[PDB]
Subunit: 105 residues, 4 copies
C-alpha cells in the first residue's frame, strides 16, 4: 500500500507547540523533503501524492532547535525509522531537552 | 509485594530530588515520602503490601512551583492494582508526564 | 475560561482507542461522562467554556482493556490539571504496561 | 551480526510497555561517525550494563535498538523498524520504552 505523511512537534518541557523545527524525510538515504514546522508545530503533508511502499526516515532537528533558543540537549536530533506498505501516517515528536518520544497517531 | 519509584525530570534530563510522594489504599494513606538525590524512593512500606487497589501520588505541581516553574498539571496520580516487586517511575515535565511498570 | 478535548491512542497496538469512558470533574462534582469515538476522540467536555479551577479528567483504561480480554496493572488514568488559553487538549497515550499525557494542541 | 564490545560509560534498559515487562533479546548497537563500536543484546532484565570496556570519549554517538526485528520474531507487527537515539558526550543511562505503536527515550539515572 501507500500512505500520506504528517507530523506535529510539541515541546513538552514548556507545554507549547514547537515552531520552526526543521524536519526531513528520506528513503534509503535519499532526501525526499526538508520542511519546517509551523506556529502550531505542524507539517500537514510531506508529499502531493501518497508515499510508495518502502523504508522511511523522518528526522527532526531538535538539538539545533533547542540550541537556537539558548538551550542544551543531550539528544542531537530525533530520527523515526518506519515502514510504509492505512491511508495516512501521523507520526508526532514529543520533545524535551532530556528525552523524546513518538507514536503512531 | 514491595513498591518503589523513580522520578526523572525529562525537561532537564536529571533526577527529581525532593518530590513528595504519597501512597494510599482506598483513600487511606499508607506512606508519605520524599525522593532522594537520585530521584528515588526505594520502599514505601517496611512491611510487604497485601492485594488491593492502590494510589501513588507525586506532588509534581508543587515541586515545579518551588523551582518557580509553571505547569498545567497539578499532581501526578497513578492508580494500580496488586493482585512480586512493583517499580512505578514517573517521567515528569511542566507540559506532560508518564508512568510505566519498570524493573 | 477554556474548552477541553482529548484523544486516546492505544500505543500497544498503534490504533485509536474507541469506546473508552472519560469523565470530567471539579471538586468531586462531575461535569461530564463521555465515550471516545472511532478516532479515539472527545471533541468537547462542556457546552460552555470551563471556568478557572482545578479539574480531574479520568479515562477508564483498566475497564477498557478488561472488556477486550487484556490485563493491566493500571486501573484507570487520572489527569489532574488547572485552568488559570482558548483550549486544553489533553491526550492519553495508553498501553497495558504504561501511560502518558501531555498538553497538546 | 556478531556480538562485541571494547569520560562517560553508557548503559541501556529496554522495557516493553505494551506488556509491562523487560525486553529480553533485543540487539542494540553503538556507533560513532559511521563506525560501529559495539553490538550487544539485552539480558533477562532488559539491560545492557556497558557498551565499552573503558569509558567512552567525548563525541557524537548513535545507539540503535533493533525493535522491529524483536517484535517480528515474537509475531507482532509494528510500523517502527528500529529505534535510533542520537546523542552527545558522568554516566549515560539511555533507556528505550517500546511498544508496537510507539517508543520513547530519556536520560535516566
Amino acid at each position: 500500500h501507500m500512505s500520506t505523511l504528517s507530523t506535529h512537534i510539541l515541546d513538552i518541557s514548556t507545554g507549547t507547540p514547537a515552531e520552526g523545527v526543521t524536519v526531513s524525510l528520506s528513503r534509503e538515504g535519499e532526501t525526499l523533503a526538508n520542511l519546517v514546522t509551523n506556529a502550531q508545530g505542524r507539517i500537514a503533508t510531506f508529499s502531493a501524492a501518497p508515499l510508495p511502499a518502502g523504508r522511511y526516515c523522518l528526522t527532526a532537528e531538535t538539538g539545533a532547535w533547542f540550541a537556537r533558543a539558548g538551550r542544551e540537549s543531550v539528544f542531537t536530533r530525533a530520527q523515526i525509522d518506519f515502514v510504509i506498505g492505512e491511508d495516512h501516517f501521523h507520526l508526532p515528536f514529543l520533545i524535551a531537552p532530556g528525552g523524546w518520544s513518538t507514536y503512531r497517531g
